[PDB]
């Protein structure tokens, strides 16, 4: 109950990196996606180590220039979604109509150590995938948050026009893909907060997608039917506000309902009554030591479920979004003894 949660580095990626994303394994080991230099997912094994080892998994080339969002599907299969970018540039917008969904298969004992990965479907007239997150009574099946520029170009962007934002379900079995709720300013982004996405990172628990947005201060949830549409009058809920630029959250330890949430070089943990404190970095005796953090994750193995660990993308706390000094990075905080 003394803040700053106690924390440590798992592991730095060398500058212009960009650590977006964290799915963890059964087995306890952290997947990481990156934006930059390359879109890659990258394997901590055993991360309560001092020391981890810290793996290129695959990099996904083939399709796509950058990784966004990744999420666990059936157990050990995982979906990453990515695109073509213009350029590795902190503020490089994507290439519109290059938008993918991959998979990276662990199941079974050929795939355990090396998974099998494959193209599953094209999304060309989506904006920009984000946020994976497998419905959990149907677990092919993700919903995935789509939102930034409707007219991205080569820089210098000078039409900053936001997209609606909008959430899609993808069927890993099929590929099929279709928009399942959108036009709501909820999912949207005015700049409030500077140039930025509107609906960011996603979860569904029970019958409940829970997302941030990054404008507005807000996190959300909607309550959705068998099929990831929301059921009428599909309104979403205001579940906790705090005035920070939020990335991606999730719900833990073990079963408990705290939301753990990245905010503007800082994490926060929300109550279910909307109670929000800063537990690590800037606004407390961290000061600025984990600048940029993107995502975060509970560890799952039996001796370090109460451990949070985060991603982050960048290596100094920017004077602004056009001095960015990118650097990926993992780190661990021990959630231990903290409740509302
Ligand atoms: C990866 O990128 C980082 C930048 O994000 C690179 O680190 C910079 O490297 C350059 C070149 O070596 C340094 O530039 C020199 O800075 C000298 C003094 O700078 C002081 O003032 C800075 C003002 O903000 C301050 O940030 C900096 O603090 C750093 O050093 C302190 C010890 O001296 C340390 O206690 C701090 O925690 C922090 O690490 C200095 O106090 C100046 O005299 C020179 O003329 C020259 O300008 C930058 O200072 C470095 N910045 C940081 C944040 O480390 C790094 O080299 C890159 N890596 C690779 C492999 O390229
Ligand atoms: C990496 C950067 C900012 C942090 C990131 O989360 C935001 C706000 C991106 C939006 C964009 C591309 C305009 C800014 C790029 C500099
Ligand atoms: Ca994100
Ligand atoms: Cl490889
Ligand atoms: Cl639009
Ligand atoms: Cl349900
Ligand atoms: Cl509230
Ligand atoms: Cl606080």
Request: glycine residues 8%; hydrophobic residues 40%; negative net charge.
């Given at each position: 109950?003394?803040?700053?949660?106690?924390?440590?580095?798992?592991?730095?990626?060398?500058?212009?990196?960009?650590?977006?994303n964290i799915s963890v394994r059964?087995?306890?080991?952290?997947?990481?996606?990156?934006?930059?230099?390359?879109?890659?997912?990258?394997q901590i094994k055993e991360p309560?180590?001092?020391?981890?080892?810290?793996?290129?998994?695959?990099?996904?080339?083939?399709?796509?220039?950058?990784?966004?969002?990744?999420?666990?599907?059936?157990?050990?299969?995982?979906?990453?979604?990515?695109?073509?970018?213009?350029?590795?540039?902190?503020?490089?917008?994507?290439?519109?109509?290059?938008?993918?969904?991959?998979?990276?298969?662990?199941?079974?004992?050929?795939?355990?150590?090396?998974?099998?990965?494959?193209?599953?479907?094209?999304?060309?007239?989506?904006?920009?995938?984000?946020?994976?997150?497998?419905?959990?009574?149907?677990?092919?099946?993700?919903?995935?948050?789509?939102?930034?520029?409707?007219?991205?170009?080569?820089?210098?962007?000078?039409?900053?026009?936001?997209?609606?934002?909008?959430?899609?379900?993808?069927?890993?079995?099929?590929?099929?893909?279709?928009?399942?709720?959108?036009?709501?300013?909820?999912?949207?982004?005015?700049?409030?907060?500077?140039?930025?996405?509107?609906?960011?990172?996603?979860?569904?628990?029970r019958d409940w997608l829970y997302?941030?947005?990054?404008?507005?201060?807000?996190?959300?949830?909607?309550?959705?039917?068998?099929?990831?549409?929301?059921?009428?009058?599909?309104?979403?809920?205001?579940?906790?506000?705090?005035?920070?630029?939020?990335?991606?959250?999730?719900?833990?330890?073990?079963?408990?309902?705290?939301?753990?949430?990245?905010?503007?070089?800082?994490?926060?943990?929300?109550?279910?009554?909307?109670?929000?404190?800063?537990?690590?970095?800037?606004?407390?005796?961290?000061?600025?030591?984990?600048?940029?953090?993107?995502?975060?994750?509970?560890?799952?193995?039996?001796?370090?479920?109460?451990?949070?660990?985060?991603?982050?993308?960048?290596?100094?706390?920017?004077?602004?979004?056009?001095?960015?000094?990118?650097?990926?990075?993992?780190?661990?905080?021990?959630?231990?003894?903290?409740?509302?």
């Amino acid at each position: 109950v003394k803040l700053p949660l106690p924390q440590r580095l798992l592991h730095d990626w060398a500058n212009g990196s960009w650590v977006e994303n964290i799915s963890v394994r059964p087995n306890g080991n952290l997947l990481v996606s990156t934006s930059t230099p390359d879109g890659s997912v990258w394997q901590i094994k055993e991360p309560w180590k001092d020391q981890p080892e810290v793996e290129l998994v695959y990099n996904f080339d083939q399709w796509v220039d950058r990784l966004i969002g990744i999420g666990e599907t059936t157990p050990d299969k995982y979906v990453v979604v990515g695109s073509r970018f213009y350029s590795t540039d902190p503020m490089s917008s994507h290439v519109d109509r290059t938008f993918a969904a991959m998979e990276l298969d662990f199941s079974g004992s050929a795939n355990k150590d090396k998974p099998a990965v494959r193209l599953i479907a094209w999304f060309p007239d989506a904006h920009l995938l984000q946020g994976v997150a497998a419905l959990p009574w149907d677990r092919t099946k993700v919903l995935i948050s789509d939102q930034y520029l409707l007219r991205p170009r080569a820089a210098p962007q000078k039409d900053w026009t936001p997209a609606r934002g909008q959430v899609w379900t993808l069927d890993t079995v099929t590929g099929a893909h279709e928009v399942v709720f959108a036009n709501d300013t909820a999912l949207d982004t005015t700049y409030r907060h500077g140039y930025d996405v509107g609906i960011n990172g996603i979860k569904i628990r029970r019958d409940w997608l829970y997302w941030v947005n990054s404008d507005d201060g807000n996190i959300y949830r909607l309550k959705i039917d068998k099929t990831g549409h929301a059921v009428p009058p599909a309104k979403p809920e205001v579940v906790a506000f705090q005035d920070t630029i939020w990335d991606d959250f999730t719900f833990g330890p073990e079963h408990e309902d705290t939301i753990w949430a990245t905010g503007f070089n800082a994490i926060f943990a929300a109550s279910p009554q909307g109670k929000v404190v800063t537990v690590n970095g800037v606004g407390t005796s961290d000061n600025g030591i984990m600048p940029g953090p993107t995502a975060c994750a509970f560890g799952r193995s039996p001796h370090d479920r109460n451990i949070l660990y985060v991603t982050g993308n960048m290596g100094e706390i920017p004077v602004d979004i056009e001095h960015v000094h990118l650097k990926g990075w993992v780190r661990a905080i021990d959630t231990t003894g903290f409740h509302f």
